[PDB]
Design a protein around this ligand. Structure first.
Ligand SMILES: [Mg+2]
Lengths: 48, 149, 48, 150
């Protein structure tokens, strides 16, 4: 299917913007896990 | 509290065997005749009051038991060289034996109980600091615990 | 009896201090085991 | 307060464990990291409700004691619930181009950096365990199933 200039890239932007809201929520969870891991390591380092 | 009860059979045997070489008159005490003559036989003969000032650490006389508690209280808090090397390896994750002076400073001058700038300087003017400010803790633990030394 | 209990309590305090020192040492040795485990695991992964 | 005495004690322990610069009061930015270490996933907007220093806050002058920390932990805890793994993997099923239940590592790592809040490659790479080896198509099930343990 052929399309005129840039339409697919703007539809892709809109589609990604639709997903960004839940992506931020998941990102907060993953960054939370990372922070918890880092802190737990820091505790072992502190006791050492 | 009674510190003597804290120590390993090997450590007690080492102290006992060492003491047996020093207790040359076999009276069980630390005395002017024995250790001064021994040190004169083993080195430069510092038989001056510098040694009396060391013998005077005990309350009056200096029995084997008092020697043991003195060295005990002095060893209170100390740990194995491998365990200390493990504790350092928690920061030196690559186990390079090459921890930086900035890292060492960060770990000590604010974090937890504060080491003084004088204590930090002591760790450079006696302990194994090296080029570019790398610090060889594998050598440090050896001289700290007096193991393989 | 007060003197006896004082001696006993001081002995129990000494034993408790020894036990806490031992607990700390066992913790740091467990951290050593963990460190060796991680290092060896990473070495085997890198060799693989 | 909805937290138990044991939870309050644990939070107080954590508060003084994740220290220090020098003072016994936690830093304004670092507080958020403590909340995240306590397994919560709020947005930075939750902190912006208190709005300590409207400008760039390297100085962190809005330090907190435990009595100021605990209410923030509570409003975080009562903020929202979080969805199941299906809500996550639906996003991946939309991002995917193969239609096979996996996704290209190089693409997904970039997408998860550009979209929404920004993260480093150092942060993102640590999230994956099924690394991009001979096979480019990472099974995103492992990623979500691992991180959701936190
Ligand atoms: Mg003698």
């Amino acid at each position: 299917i052929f399309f005129r200039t840039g339409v697919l890239a703007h539809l892709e932007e809109e589609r990604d913007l639709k997903i960004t809201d839940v992506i931020i929520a998941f990102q907060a969870q993953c960054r939370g896990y990372l922070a918890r891991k880092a802190f737990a390591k820091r505790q072992q380092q502190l006791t050492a | 509290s009674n510190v003597f009860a804290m120590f390993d059979q090997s450590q007690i045997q080492e102290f006992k065997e060492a003491f047996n070489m020093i207790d040359q008159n076999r009276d069980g005490f630390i005395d002017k005749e024995d250790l001064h003559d021994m040190l004169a036989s083993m080195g430069k003969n510092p038989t001056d009051e510098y040694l009396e000032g060391m013998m005077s650490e005990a309350p009056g006389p200096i029995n084997f038991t008092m020697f043991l508690t003195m060295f005990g209280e002095k060893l209170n808090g100390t740990d194995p060289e491998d365990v200390i090397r493990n504790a350092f390896a928690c920061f030196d994750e690559e186990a390079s034996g090459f921890i930086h002076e900035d890292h060492l400073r960060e770990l000590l001058t604010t974090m937890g109980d504060r080491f003084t700038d004088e204590e930090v300087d002591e760790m450079y003017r006696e302990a194994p600091i090296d080029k570019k400010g790398n610090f060889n803790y594998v050598e440090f633990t050896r001289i700290l615990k007096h193991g393989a030394k | 009896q007060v003197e006896e209990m004082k001696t006993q309590l001081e002995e129990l305090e000494d034993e408790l201090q020894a036990a806490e020192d031992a607990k700390l040492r066992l913790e740091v040795n467990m951290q050593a085991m963990k460190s060796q485990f991680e290092r060896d695991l990473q070495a085997r992964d890198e060799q693989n | 307060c909805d937290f138990s005495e044991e939870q309050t004690a644990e939070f107080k322990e954590a508060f003084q464990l994740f220290d220090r610069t020098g003072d016994g009061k936690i830093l304004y930015s670092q507080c958020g990291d403590v909340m995240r270490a306590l397994g919560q996933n709020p947005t930075n907007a939750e902190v912006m409700k208190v709005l300590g220093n409207p400008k760039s806050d390297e100085m962190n002058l809005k330090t907190l004691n435990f009595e100021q920390f605990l209410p923030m932990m509570q409003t975080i805890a009562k903020n929202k619930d979080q969805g199941c793994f299906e809500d996550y993997v639906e996003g991946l099923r939309v991002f995917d181009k193969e239609g096979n239940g996996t996704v290209m590592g190089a693409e997904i790592r970039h997408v998860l950096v550009t979209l929404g809040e920004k993260m480093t490659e150092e942060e993102v790479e640590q999230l994956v365990a099924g690394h991009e080896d001979s096979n480019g198509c990472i099974n995103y099930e492992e990623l979500v199933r691992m991180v959701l343990s936190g």
